[PDB]
Symmetry: D3
Subunit: 114 residues, 6 copies
C-alpha cells in the first residue's frame, strides 16, 4: 500500500522541486479540479476513477481509489463506476479493473484493523 | 446540428445491429444498461459517461452523453465541473472536443429554453 | 463518397511522400508490405488491419481496410465477426466508428451490385 | 512468468466478478464469447485478439491471447506476421511490448516442447 | 478552410471560456504558457507540440501547431523531419492525419507568399 | 532489454527489422539536430506513456547534451498535452533522470 504512498509524496515533491512554474501550476490544477463545487468530492473522485480506468493508469486508479474510500464511497459505488469505464474503455481495461479490485480490498482490510 | 445527430445514431445503430451479431446486440445493450440507476443516480452515471467520452475524445459519444446529462437535469455547472476533470486528466488534446461540446450544449440549452424536446 | 475517399487517399498520399523524406517513403512501404501474403493470407492480413484500425478509431484507415477485405473476398459475415472483437476490446467509444463502417460497407456491397 | 500470470488472472478475475455486478459479469462473458468459431476460424479470431491487444499495449491481454494462439495451433511465423501488423499500425511505442511477448511466446514453446500443459 | 478554422476556434474558445470555470481558464492559460521560449526556443516547443499532437492524432491541435511552427520560421524540412518521428512512434494510424497536415501546410505557405495574415 | 531486441529481430521478420531501422534512422541529425530529435522522442513517449521508450530517450537526451532545464521544458509540454494521467510516468522520469546525474557525475558510460 504505502509503498506507493511514499512513491507518490516523494516522487511528487522532486518533480515540483526540480520543476517549473508551469509544472507547479499544472499539479495545483490537477488537485484543484477535484475540490467540491456543484458536485461533491465523492462524485469527482469517482469521475477521476473512471477517467483513470479508461485511460489505464494503474497509479492514478490507485490514488483515486484511496480518495473515494476516504470520501466514503461504497464498494457498490466504486464498482458501479468501474462498470462504466469497463464498457466504454473495453476489455483491454480488465487487467486494470482486475488489479484495482485487489487494491480496494487491501484498502478495506485496514478499515477492520484501524 | 442536433437533429443531424440523434437521427444518424438511431439510423446507423439500427443498421449496425441488423447486419450485426447476437454479440453486437449484447454489447450495445450493455452500453445502455451500465448507465441505469443503482447506488449512484442516473445523472451521476451520465456525467461519468461524459468524463470517459471526453478523455477518450469521441465526439458522438460526447454528444450523446450531453443530451443524457441534460435530460437528467445536470446544470451547466455540473457538466463543466466534469468536463474540467476530463480536460485536466486527458490533457489539452481534449480541447478541440471541449469546444464542440460547448457549442452543442448551447444548442440543447436554447431548445430547452424554447420548451423543445430533446431525448 | 468512395472515389472522393480514394482519389484523396492516393493524392494526399504521393503528396505526403512528395514533400516527405526517405524515412517517410520507407515507412509507407512498410505499412503496405506487412499486409503481403505469408503464413497468413492477404485476407486474414487485411482483417487484422481492420481490427487494428477500429480499436484505434481511425475512420480513414478503417475505410481502407474495409474496402480491402471486400476485394479480398471477405463476407459481411466475416468482416462483422472481426468488428465484434474490435468492439469488445476497444469499448463503447468505438461504436460511432462502427456506425460509419457499416454505412460504408453496404455502400460497397451496393457498388459491386453494378461492378 | 506464465504460471503466475494464469494464476493471478484467474484469481483476480473471480475476485472482480465476485465483488461486481451482472454488468461486470455480462461484459466478461462477452469478452470470451466474441472469440468463438464463426464464418471465421478461432485461430483467426484469437490472432485478431493478439493484434488488438498489441496496438493497445496491454501486456496481460497480450500474454493471454498468446497462450490462446498457441493453444489453437498458430505457428510462431503466423504469430509474427500478426505482430508486425500491430507494430507497424501501432508505432514504435509498441516495441517494448513486442519484446515481452517474445520472451513469453518462447516460454510457452519450451513448455510445449517438454509436453507441459498450456491452458 | 483556414479563415473558417481560425474564426471558429477563436469564437469557440471564447465560448468555452465564458461558459467555463476558473479551472478551465487556468488550464487554457497553462496550455499557452508552456510553449513560451525558455531554455528551448519557441520553434522547438511548437514542433514538440506538433509531434505530441500528431502521435495523439488531434487534427485541430495539429493544424494549430502547424501555423505556429510556420509563423516561427520552421522550414517544411524541419516540420517533416519532426513528423517522421511522430509517424514511426505513433504508427501508421497517424498517416491519415499526416495527409491533412500536408495539404494544410502548403495552404499556409500560400497565404504568406502573399503576406496574408496568420 | 538491449538483448531482448535481439530476440525480437532474431525471431522477427524482414519487416520487423525494417521497422526497427526507421525507429533508429528517424532520430539522426538532419535539418533538426539530435538533441532536439531525442527531446521530441521524449515528448511523444511521454504523452503516449511508454516508460521503456521514455527511459531510453532520457539517456539519449542526457547523453546528447540536453540539460535537465531543457528536459523539463520538454516534459511540461508532454504533461499539458497528455494530461494528468502522465504524472505517474513524469515521476519515474524525474527519478530516472537524476539517477543519470548521480552517475554521469562519477564518470560513467551510457549505452
Amino acid at each position: 500500500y504505502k509503498k506507493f504512498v511514499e512513491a507518490r509524496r516523494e516522487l511528487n515533491e522532486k518533480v515540483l522541486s526540480r520543476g517549473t512554474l508551469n509544472t507547479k501550476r499544472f499539479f495545483n490544477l490537477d488537485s484543484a479540479v477535484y475540490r467540491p463545487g456543484k458536485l461533491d468530492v465523492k462524485t469527482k473522485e469517482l469521475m477521476g476513477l473512471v477517467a483513470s480506468t479508461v485511460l489505464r493508469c494503474d497509479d492514478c486508479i490507485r490514488y483515486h481509489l484511496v480518495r473515494c474510500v476516504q470520501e466514503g464511497a461504497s464498494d457498490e459505488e466504486i464498482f458501479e463506476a468501474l462498470d462504466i469505464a469497463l464498457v466504454v474503455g473495453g476489455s483491454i481495461v480488465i487487467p486494470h479493473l482486475r488489479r484495482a479490485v485487489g487494491f480496494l480490498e487491501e484498502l478495506r482490510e485496514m478499515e477492520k484493523n484501524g
